């Protein structure tokens, strides 16, 4: 067998897009653009523009729904106490900083400064989001304050206080490590956490290509809108791409044909734009659903699912806000410095077979001990950490040893 004798604390970052810009296009203003002849001809085609407007409006509402689903998950606005005694853990770079404008943190400022890159057109409008950036920052601040001050209690009912070291002892107990390992190694764990948090900002300060997904979404939307605008300078087989020239240089009865030729192409362009917008919106909705699940299951609790929140054994997670998305900082436990031992499945003593209650039998070469499965801490094999079942002639791999009886010395000396 191999058993680890040390550990490391690792924090990692995950980026998720949740929202998308809300745009609106007026069908008749785009197709016709201040021409009564074009509008009267377009009246003949039924109700295509109403359908396009309905689709775009639905897409616009879905974005606010996504943001509300992801972020508005806390009933009250929690605050941290003015005195910060968290057992040596330093959260100064993720808590809100109120000297500077807005209530953003250091890392949120880095994220907002990193992601940087239209105008007023013929029928194009951009609608503002319902929640400003300050309100999203205030949600994230409330979530951080709650998870630092109360643990996972505020996600089920009312928040209940608990000292931070005791909370982290709970969290070690939840991954199969006893409370001894934390209280005897508090300073080292705090130092490792502080160093990892310090490395996060260095990693995402100099490097810029980390926020690839958000910029990818922004670029795709901008490119689609630019292509739609540029498609207005094509004649689609007509004599010109300008309606004024057609109207002036030709009388109506054979201007009808050119106007229809332009109208069909512009309708086709609008339809293809709306269809690709619908597909992209569906993809963004799936991403936002995943982000909401992660916030519910990893910030408001401790997760047992493998690799759902970081690599390793999940300890805890912290949220941060980005221009059009969310960032998760996952703190996990990683065993290290393994050593190599020999094992046995059971121990025969007095003709009976003994199995460990919660550990494994190991030996350093001569003597046998019982240890945890995730940290080396040997102990004497007594009758208080083993249980007996059957005789020792049926298990494959039995070795002989002695099991200590604590009551024998006390009821022999004092009889």
């Amino acid at each position: 067998i191999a058993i680890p004798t040390n550990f490391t604390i690792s924090v990692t970052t995950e980026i998720l897009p949740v929202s998308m810009t809300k745009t609106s296009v007026d069908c008749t203003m785009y197709i016709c653009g201040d021409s009564t002849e074009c509008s009267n001809l377009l009246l003949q085609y039924g109700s295509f523009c109403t359908q396009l407007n309905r689709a775009l409006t639905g897409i616009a509402v879905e974005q606010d729904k996504n943001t509300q689903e992801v972020f508005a998950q806390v009933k009250q606005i929690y605050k941290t106490p003015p005195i910060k005694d968290f057992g040596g853990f330093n959260f100064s770079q993720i808590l809100p900083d109120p000297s500077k404008p807005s209530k953003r943190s250091f890392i949120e400022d880095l994220l907002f400064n990193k992601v940087t890159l239209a105008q007023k057109f013929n029928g194009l409008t951009v609608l503002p989001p319902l929640l400003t950036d300050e309100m999203i920052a205030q949600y994230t601040s409330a979530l951080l304050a709650g998870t630092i001050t109360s643990g996972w209690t505020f996600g089920a009912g009312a928040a209940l206080q608990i000292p931070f070291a005791m909370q982290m002892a709970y969290r070690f107990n939840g991954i199969g490590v006893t409370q001894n390992v934390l209280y005897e190694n508090q300073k080292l764990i705090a130092n490792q956490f502080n160093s990892a948090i310090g490395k996060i900002q260095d990693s995402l300060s100099s490097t810029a290509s980390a926020l690839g997904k958000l910029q990818d979404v922004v670029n795709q939307n901008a490119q689609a809108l630019n292509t739609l605008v540029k498609q207005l300078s094509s004649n689609f087989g007509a004599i010109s791409s300008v309606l004024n020239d057609i109207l002036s240089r030709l009388d109506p009865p054979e201007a009808e044909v050119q106007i229809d030729r332009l109208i069909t192409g512009r309708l086709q362009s609008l339809q293809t734009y709306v269809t690709q917008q619908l597909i992209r919106a569906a993809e963004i909705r799936a991403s936002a659903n995943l982000a909401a699940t992660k916030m519910s299951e990893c910030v408001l609790g401790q997760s047992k699912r493998v690799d759902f929140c970081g690599k390793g054994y999940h300890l805890m997670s912290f949220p941060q806000s980005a221009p059009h998305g969310v960032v998760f900082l996952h703190v996990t436990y990683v065993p290290a410095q393994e050593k190599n031992f020999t094992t046995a499945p059971a121990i025969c003593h007095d003709g009976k077979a003994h199995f460990p209650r919660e550990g494994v039998f190991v030996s350093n070469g001569t003597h046998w001990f019982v240890t945890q499965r995730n940290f080396y801490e040997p102990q004497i094999i007594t009758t208080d950490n083993t249980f007996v079942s059957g005789n020792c002639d049926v298990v494959i791999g039995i070795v002989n040893n002695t099991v200590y009886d604590p009551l024998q010395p006390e009821l022999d000396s004092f009889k």
Binding site: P128, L130, L131, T132
Partner: protein, 77 residues
């Protein structure tokens, strides 16, 4: 009226365009609602953090996220 100054609203029913209660938001120009200094839970989403409700007459306010709460944190409590 979306993304337009409240100045040139009436130039381009006629009682819902006069300068009785005129408010310049970031989503546009709002006519017919009174701007209060309070904050409540959102009722009708107007935008950019501004909501509207009916309370007598129609009022427009800034959204409130929730109720403040400070947890009595201590290192042995």
């Amino acid at each position: 009226y979306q993304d337009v100054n409240c100045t040139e609203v009436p130039v381009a029913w006629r009682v819902y365009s006069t300068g009785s209660n005129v408010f310049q938001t970031r989503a546009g120009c709002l006519i017919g609602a009174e701007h209060v200094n309070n904050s409540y839970e959102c009722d009708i989403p107007i935008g950019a953090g501004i909501c509207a409700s009916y309370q007598q007459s129609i009022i427009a306010y800034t959204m409130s996220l929730g109720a403040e709460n400070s947890v009595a944190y201590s290192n042995n409590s």
